[PDB]
Design a protein around this ligand. Structure first.
Ligand SMILES: O=C(CCCC[C@@H]1SC[C@@H]2NC(=O)N[C@@H]21)NC1CCN(c2ccncc2)CC1
Ligand SMILES: O=C(CCCC[C@@H]1SC[C@@H]2NC(=O)N[C@@H]21)NC1CCN(c2ccncc2)CC1
Ligand SMILES: O=C(CCCC[C@@H]1SC[C@@H]2NC(=O)N[C@@H]21)NC1CCN(c2ccncc2)CC1
Ligand SMILES: O=C(CCCC[C@@H]1SC[C@@H]2NC(=O)N[C@@H]21)NC1CCN(c2ccncc2)CC1
Lengths: 122, 121, 121, 122
């Protein structure tokens, strides 16, 4: 309910998601950055019965960066929580793993943090 | 290919996954550590057309730590890659986020690394 | 250049640092969050000859959470870069490791991100 | 005492460190991987009065990847703990930040994990 909708992060990427009764997140992700174009399938999970003490709602989702137009041989997982209120927000940290050989595994994973709100960028 | 089946990490957790033709990962996770018991639903994605240059196959999945027995108000995502061969493995790094108040948000996320193999430790 | 001085992050912590000619960072950290009080010693390194292409200046530092008042048996490292300009900032990600038994090692490391500015929040 | 010495990680990198009475780590790092050659200065901190319940000793250190031969405009911090015993070990996770513009900040930080032991590679 509160999670379902269209969200945008600080890069201008577009996160369209539906939070289902079974605890699943399903939708599409469009990244404004990197080796990506148009929409990618996402799937994830969220806590469908969160605490009522003011705590956020834990969640996560994955995008593999392959669609009909491009394959960047990589995947990002976002782990975070939804925080409701006047300015609802999803605060995340993410891990992006690139397909790599063994000589290059050490350099295979980027880390970052994305904040999502429902405010469409200008 | 090669991803579908049962995998074990260094903690003894059991990762049961099916890699579908549409790039989907679907299965169950049983953690040997933390506030967890029995199996939890997992869903994720993998590169269904990986490079042919010897690179691994990038993938990720999520578990929310709620099932019919308990709810630990948290979720873990594993991000990594499958590497095939005689000693196949899925090498991952993970982020566990706990549902938290704003006063405790700074301390809400654990990070780690799990190595999954076809043979238990 | 531009690094030496007092900085504040979004939690209200105070980062007092001197960037030396030898690439060293030296100063004190006062955390507004966690098991911490008063100042802690910090030491780190920065690129003393950064690129001239508009890139930030890479740097990192460590605090062990022991001083003469308390010891929280943990240490944080911040890894990031200084970006100069009208709204200068040091953008970081951090890893806090707690001294832990092997049974709790999987849960020993927190991860986060701190943005430091010259103006308090 | 237990921390002071020469350590090697799974990549074959060489970590020469002295743990001082003031809580400081000082020494040199030589990376077997990446845009690095010869030795780099490191500095860090460790818990000089760790717990006595079997817990490890928390510590961290930083290398900026500039020396007299090369500058890779980047820095790595390792955060971890020393675990004593028959096979003493330093278990770490690390963050490597590369100098970047604003268009590229999202991709500026690699993450990984290094295990150090005193066994010299063959
Ligand atoms: O780029 C992608 C796919 C798109 C990822 C978009 C990322 S997901 C976390 C963050 N949040 C967003 O909303 N968007 C970004 N994958 C590899 C390709 C090789 N990489 C580079 C980087 C820089 N230059 C050249 C090559 C590293 C990343
Ligand atoms: O334990 C779980 C759920 C099971 C996580 C299992 C983890 S997934 C990565 C790793 N790989 C595995 O195979 N297993 C482990 N959630 C905790 C998180 C930490 N929590 C707190 C809260 C307050 N203070 C301290 C800690 C709250 C609940
Ligand atoms: O709090 C501190 C020391 C101060 C850390 C302050 C942190 S540094 C990154 C961030 N940026 C700041 O400016 N401030 C915060 N150490 C804790 C770690 C968590 N600990 C446990 C143990 C068991 N269960 C749960 C948690 C043990 C002690
Ligand atoms: O490489 C370095 C400096 C050496 C880092 C060595 C790393 S520290 C953590 C790990 N533990 C070790 O012992 N060693 C490795 N810095 C940038 C340069 C640009 N980068 C690449 C990567 C791959 N191809 C091309 C360019 C990313 C990294």
């Amino acid at each position: 309910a509160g999670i379902t909708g269209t969200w945008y992060n600080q890069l201008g990427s577009t996160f369209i998601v539906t939070a289902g009764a079974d605890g699943a997140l399903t939708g599409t992700y469009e990244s404004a950055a990197g080796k990506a174009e148009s929409r990618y399938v996402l799937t994830g999970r969220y806590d469908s019965a969160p605490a009522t003490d003011g705590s956020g709602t834990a969640l996560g989702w994955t995008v593999a960066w392959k669609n009909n137009y491009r394959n960047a041989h990589s995947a990002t997982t976002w782990s975070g929580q939804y925080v409701g209120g006047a300015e609802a927000r999803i605060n995340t940290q993410w891990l992006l793993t690139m397909g790599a050989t063994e000589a290059n595994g050490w350099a295979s994973t980027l880390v970052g943090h994305d904040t999502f709100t429902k405010v469409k960028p200008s």
